Amino acid sequence: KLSEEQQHIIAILLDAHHKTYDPTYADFRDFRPPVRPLSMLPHLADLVSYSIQKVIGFAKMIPGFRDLTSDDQIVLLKSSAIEVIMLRSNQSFTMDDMSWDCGSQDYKYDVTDVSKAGHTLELIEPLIKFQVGLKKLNLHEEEHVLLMAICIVSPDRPGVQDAKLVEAIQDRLSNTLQTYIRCRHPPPGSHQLYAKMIQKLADLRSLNEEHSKQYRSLSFQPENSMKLTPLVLEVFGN
């Protein structure tokens, strides 16, 4: 049932993720140092800016993504970047203390680090719930990279021009994920697994909207915008 075109898609996405995710987190030393009001904003701005670069590298390798116009590629990455960052951040998230552990203690982040960057509980608590619920899904890496790709190529993102071409690319990844779960994910973990993953995509839209609200409020202060990066200002807005 899992066609070889579908196995091929999964292998490309696996290779793309492994090429764009460094579990050593060695590049974190080039960021501005973590400082523990808004003391974590410079470090977290560099972290997001770095992650945006990785999401772009991953997205470029999604089968069919390049067939979109540069405009459609830009609006999809602009809209999806923070959601893909939320998804890929789950690999470092640990449920033993509800934190993102990236090796050393300096690069072990909790909720107080998010608040020390300007963000409130309106985002922080739904974000932790999302990370816990995503972790509880116990996704195969095949399902994890498929979910990130499906997230990016969504035809209902604002500013999308060729929605039907975006929909065709997503449908090929969607049928690949649906078929993968039925053939390669054994019960009971497979139970309604596709439905639970699509629900996480809905949660990501909600988390995206709340982060945009707080980002727009935080970046409205030039004193805060000064500590951001040029890439973050371009992608997330001025």
Binding site: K60, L77, E234, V235
Partner: peptide, 11 residues
């Protein structure tokens, strides 16, 4: 609006 840094990373 133009996104030159995004466009460059998209190579």
């Amino acid at each position: 609006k133009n996104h030159p840094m995004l466009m460059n990373l998209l190579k």
